[PDB]
Amino acid sequence: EVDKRREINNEHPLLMMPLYANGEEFNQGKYTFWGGDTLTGKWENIPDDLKPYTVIQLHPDDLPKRDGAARDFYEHMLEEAAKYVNPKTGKNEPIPVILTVYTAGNMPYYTSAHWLSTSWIDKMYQKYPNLHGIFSTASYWIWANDIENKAADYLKVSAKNGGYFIWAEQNSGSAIEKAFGKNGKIAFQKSVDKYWKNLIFMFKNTPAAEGNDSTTESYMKGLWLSNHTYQWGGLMDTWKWYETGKWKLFASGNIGKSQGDRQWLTEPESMLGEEALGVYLNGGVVYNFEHPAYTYGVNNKESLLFSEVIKEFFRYVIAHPAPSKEKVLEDTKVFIHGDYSNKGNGKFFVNVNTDREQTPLYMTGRYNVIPAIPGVLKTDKLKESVSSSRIQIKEITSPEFSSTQARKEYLNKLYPMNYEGDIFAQKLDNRWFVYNYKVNENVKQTGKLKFNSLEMNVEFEPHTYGIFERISNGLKVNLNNFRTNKDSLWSNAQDANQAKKLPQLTKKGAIKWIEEHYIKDTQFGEKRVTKIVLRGIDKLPTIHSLSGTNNSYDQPSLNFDQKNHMVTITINSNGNLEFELHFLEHT
Ligand SMILES: CC(=O)N[C@@H]1[C@@H](O[C@@H]2O[C@H](CO)[C@H](O)[C@H](O[C@H]3O[C@H](CO)[C@H](O)[C@H](O)[C@H]3NC(C)=O)[C@H]2O[C@@H]2O[C@@H](C)[C@@H](O)[C@@H](O)[C@@H]2O)[C@H](O)[C@@H](CO)O[C@H]1O
Numbered sequence: 001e002v003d004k005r006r007e008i009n010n011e012h013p014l015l016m017m018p019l020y021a022n023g024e025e026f027n028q029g030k031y032t033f034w035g036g037d038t039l040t041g042k043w044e045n046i047p048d049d050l051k052p053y054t055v056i057q058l059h060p061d062d063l064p065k066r067d068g069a070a071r072d073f074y075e076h077m078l079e080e081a082a083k084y085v086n087p088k089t090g091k092n093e094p095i096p097v098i099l100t101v102y103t104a105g106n107m108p109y110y111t112s113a114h115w116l117s118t119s120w121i122d123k124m125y126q127k128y129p130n131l132h133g134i135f136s137t138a139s140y141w142i143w144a145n146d147i148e149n150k151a152a153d154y155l156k157v158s159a160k161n162g163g164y165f166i167w168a169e170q171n172s173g174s175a176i177e178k179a180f181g182k183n184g185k186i187a188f189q190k191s192v193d194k195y196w197k198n199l200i201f202m203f204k205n206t207p208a209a210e211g212n213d214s215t216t217e218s219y220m221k222g223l224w225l226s227n228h229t230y231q232w233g234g235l236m237d238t239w240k241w242y243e244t245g246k247w248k249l250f251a252s253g254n255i256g257k258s259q260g261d262r263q264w265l266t267e268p269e270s271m272l273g274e275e276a277l278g279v280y281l282n283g284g285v286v287y288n289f290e291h292p293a294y295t296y297g298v299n300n301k302e303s304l305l306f307s308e309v310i311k312e313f314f315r316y317v318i319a320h321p322a323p324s325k326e327k328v329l330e331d332t333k334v335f336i337h338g339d340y341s342n343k344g345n346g347k348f349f350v351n352v353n354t355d356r357e358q359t360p361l362y363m364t365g366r367y368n369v370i371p372a373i374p375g376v377l378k379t380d381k382l383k384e385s386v387s388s389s390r391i392q393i394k395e396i397t398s399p400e401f402s403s404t405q406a407r408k409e410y411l412n413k414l415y416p417m418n419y420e421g422d423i424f425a426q427k428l429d430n431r432w433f434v435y436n437y438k439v440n441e442n443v444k445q446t447g448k449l450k451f452n453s454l455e456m457n458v459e460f461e462p463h464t465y466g467i468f469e470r471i472s473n474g475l476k477v478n479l480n481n482f483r484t485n486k487d488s489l490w491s492n493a494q495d496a497n498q499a500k501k502l503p504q505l506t507k508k509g510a511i512k513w514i515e516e517h518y519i520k521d522t523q524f525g526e527k528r529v530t531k532i533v534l535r536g537i538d539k540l541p542t543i544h545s546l547s548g549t550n551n552s553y554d555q556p557s558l559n560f561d562q563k564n565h566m567v568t569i570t571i572n573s574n575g576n577l578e579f580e581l582h583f584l585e586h587t
Contacts, residue, residue, distance in 0.1 A: 001197065002162040005132045006055075006096065008200060008231050009285060010321040015050065015314050016057040016098060016135075016166075016288040017042065017296065021073050023062035023112075031076045034061060035293045035511055039080050041300035043095045044087075047311070053318060055132055056081065057288070059100040063112035070112040071120060074099055078128050094130035098166065101154060102136035105144030118153045125161035133164035137235070138204055140175040148179060152191035159195040168202040168235045168288065171216040174341040177374040180228070182339065189376065192228055200286055201229040205275070208240035211346030211357040215372075218336070218349075221282050222371035225329055226382040233286025236275040236360065238267040238294055244358050248487060250442045253496025261510035262490065262502070264291045265518075268463035268483040269305040273313050274424075274435045275360045277465060280317050281426050281433060282369045283328040287314065293514050301519055308482045308549050312576050316467070316478070323428065328371075329387035333414040336372035337379055338396025352407050361437045365426025367415045372396070421447030423460065434458055435465035454585055455535040461528050468532075474541060474582040479530060482549060482575045485523040489513070525574045527554065532569040534583070541567055541583035549575025 008014045019039060022032045032038075039056060046054050058077055063069045081095040101121060104110035125131050134154055139147055151167065158165040169175050174182060181189040192199060201223055203216040220232040242263035245254040249266060272295065276287060287310075289295035295310065297303040302311070323331070340348055346357055353370075355363040362369075373379070379393050392414070394400060400410035419425045423445035425434045436445045442462060449456045451470040458466065464481040493499035505513065517523070534541070540560035552575030559568040565586040571577065 002160065004198075005129070005162045005164075008164065010283065010324055013053055013285040013314070013317050013322070014233070014287070015054045016286070017046070017054055018057045018059055018288065018290070018292045020059045020061040020292060021063050023064060026063055026069065026073060031073060034507075035297075035514075036299040037297070038300060039077055039095065040084060043084065045300050045302070049318075050311070050314065053314070055096045055098050057098040057100065057135055059103075060112045065108060065110075065112055065114070067115040070116050074116075074124070078124060078131065081130055082128055094128075096130050096132050097128070098133045098135050099124070099131065100137060101134045102150065103138055105139045105142035105147060106150070107142060107144065110142070118157055121154070122157050122160065125157065125163055131163065133166055133200075134158060135166045135168070137168040138206065140170050140172040140204070140207065143173060143175060143178060148181070148185040148188040151179065152187040155188070155191045155195045155199055159198040162198075164198055164200050164230075166200040166202065166286070168204040169216075170204045170207050170210075171212045171219060171340060171345065172207050172210050174339065176216060176219045177339050177341055177376065180374050181376040182374060196228055197230045199229045200231050200233065202232060202286055202288065203234040204237065205234065205360050206237040206239050206243065206290070208243040208358055208360070209245075213360045214346050214349040214354050214362075214369075215340035217278060217282070217369055218340070218372040219374065220284065221328075221369050222335065222373040224283065225325060225332065225335070225371050226373050226377070226379060228373065228377060228381075231285050233284040233288070234275070234279045235288040235290065236272055237290040238264045238272070239290055240360065241267045246440055247496060247499045248490035248493075250440060251490070251496070251499075253499075255496050255500040258500045259502060259505070261505035261507060265294055265489060265510060265513070266486045269309045270463045270465065270480050270482045271361075271439075272305065273309045273480050274437075274463070274465050276310075276313050277433060277435065278360075278362065278369065280322050281365070281428065283323045283325060285317075285322055293511055294518075298511060298514050298519065303514065303518065304482070304484065304522060308576050309480060312480070326387045329385060329391070331368075332371060332388075332391050334370055334411060335379070335382065335391050335393045336370060336396050336401070337393055338372070338375045340372065340396070343396055343401065348401075348407075351404050352411070355437055356439075359437075359439050361435070361439065362424050363422075363437045365424055365433070366417060367411050368426055370411070419447055419449050421445070423447035423458075425449055430470045432456070432468045433465070434460065434468070436460040436462045438462040453536055457531075457533040457535070459529075459531040461530070464530060466530075471580070474580060475534070476580050477532070477578065479571065479573070479577040480575070481528060481530065481573060482552075483525045484518075485525045488517065488523055524552075527552070527572045527574050530571040530573065532571070533566060534569070534581075535564070535566045536585050537565050537567050538584040538586045541581040544580040544582060546579040548573065548577035553577055
């Protein structure tokens with residue numbers, strides 16, 4: 001094995017920071033990115049605590065579809081990255097880079113990436129120590145004839161140089177299964193047998209109308225646990241709102257795929273944190289987002305989605321490393337072997353742990369994410385692990401998985417019910433993770449969670465998550481319900497018919513909207529109420545270390561009921577929030 005250029009694991013997670021080439025400006029002789037970020041300015045802006053865990057991902061976007069364009073742009077940017085000097089210290093501190101090398105099947109009618117040879121990639125790895133990996137993304141919808149063969153070559157050239165091959169794909173049309181050899185294209189399967197330590201496989205949740213979120217995430221987890229990938233993660237995409245035909249938040253009616261640029265702006269900010277918790281809580285460590293102008297920002301400035309949700313979430317996963325492969329294996333009671341494409345795809349989990357076909361969220365954490373691998377693969381390396389001795393490995397064609405009811409009956413015997421209420425909750429060590437799982441319905445949810453004898457009841461509005469940690473002196477609370485008001489994007493439309501007919505915002509228009517109405521002059525959402533009730537408390541708790549999004553929260557209200565040894569905490573907020581409550585239990 002060649003020494004790895006970087007570590008990627010629970011203690012060293014990875015946030016990919018996409019920069020998309022501006023092809024129109026490239027035609028004018030300029031080297032720029034859509035949204036106005038610069039490579040150097042963007043990197044400088046990344047908080048110093050995050051720099052060790054963040055890598056710039058160049059994407060060739062609409063560069064000219066002909067030989068040389070992508071090489072020219074990428075070499076320019078690799079040079080800029082290589083020569084970067086930290087202005088505080090004066091030292092050359094090369095910026096770490098990942099190159100997008102494969103997308104849209106590398107069809108010459110879809111992408112400039114077609115004209116990036118493996119030879120060139122090898123040359124760039126050898127020239128630039130700061131090139132840490134290469135990225136393939138979004139070919140599930142155009143599964144080119146040689147895609148598996150090329151993936152093998154990308155993984156091999158990465159292993160040769162100590163870099164990572166990172167592949168983000170969703171299981172549309174059996175893509176994940178095909179990648180590993182389902183239809184007889186086995187070059188990548190064979191490559192993985194040798195080079196899996198240099199592979200990162202991620203979901204890409206963009207094609208949301210097809211409902212493959214749960215099954216793709218299951219595969220990503222299972223591939224990792226069975227040593228077919230070094231680590232896993234997910235690309236979480238606000239374009240899902242377009243794919244599913246949603247418009248104004250909570251409105252009725254469906255507008256289809258008709259208002260793209262308005263639609264990718266509308267997903268609630270905090271909902272990206274809810275999606276990301278599914279990666280974290282299941283041992284994933286790599287995160288990426290689209291649309292970048294909304295999820296990260298523009299003009300070397302952080303969007304509020306980035307600053308108030310993604311940045312704080314990512315800091316959390318650095319401070320509290322995700323469960324290790326060993327831990328996740330120990331916790332796994334059931335491991336599925338077989339093809340979700342033959343068992344209804346995402347429908348497999350509907351009314352098991354998802355509430356509907358088209359969602360990136362879960363309705364219970366009881367089973368967390370059940371890991372799986374495609375039928376074409378073997379569970380040999382899984383069984384070889386010291387930590388897999390108590391796992392039931394089951395064929396997907398088992399009677400236990402034949403129907404929704406059979407699945408729950410079988411799983412319920414191995415995963416005990418561990419909380420009450422119709423809400424998402426999952427426990428890790430001394431921490432309850434909770435979120436309201438509604439996507440586009442304005443319905444409050446409630447749960448009852450326990451820390452031994454201490455009872456905690458919560459009431460959450462949609463697009464609200466919380467992390468509640470029992471600490472020696474009380475409870476640490478992290479809460480995020482940040483959701484700005486996007487109604488202005490949908491003004492002049494009183495129903496779905498009118499919304500579908502709105503003038504197109506356009507790509508440039510959406511970037512301008514972000515600049516003039518999101519980065520500044522932001523239409524913040526209304527403060528909204530979260531309730532937390534603790535039962536089994538000795539005396540009125542005290543509050544400590546209260547902070548959160550500026551101007552986003554009222555002072556929490558504590559109402560202690562001595563007779564009943566309970567406190568009711570009422571929070572009115574819209575943002576991220578954190579505090580500690582100090583108390584003793586009543587005995
Ligand atoms: C399968 C699917 O859902 N979509 C295919 C397209 O892939 C992505 O789909 C989005 C719509 O759901 C959208 O069109 C994405 O591209 C726009 O947004 C990105 C940033 O998020 C860029 O600004 C693009 O320039 C912009 N496109 C346009 C025309 O303005 C699109 O994602 C992009 O393309 C894919 C292939 C991949 O490279 C991604 O990394 C990249 O962001 C697909 O592009 C389209 C082509 O006809 O076909 C859809 O079925």
